[PDB]
Amino acid sequence: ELSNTRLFVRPFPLDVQESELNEIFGPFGPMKEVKILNGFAFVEFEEAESAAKAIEEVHGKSFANQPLEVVYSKLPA
Contact 9, 40 (CB under 8 A): yes
CA distances from 57 to 11, 37, 77 (A): 16, 23, 24
The CATH number assigned to the domain holding 36 equals 3.30.70.330
Measured between alpha carbons, how far is 25 from 50 in angstroms, rounded to an integer?
A: 9
CA torsion sign, 8 to 12 to 18 to 22? Answer: negative
Q: After which residues does the chain have a break in its backbone, defined as C to next N over 2.5 Å?
A: none
Measured between alpha carbons, how far is 61 from 26 in angstroms, rounded to an integer?
A: 17
Q: Which spans in the chain are helix H?
A: 18-25, 48-58
Domain that holds residue 77: 1-77
Closest CA to 45 of 34, 55, 37, 57: 34
| Total structural domains within the chain | 1
Solved with: NMR
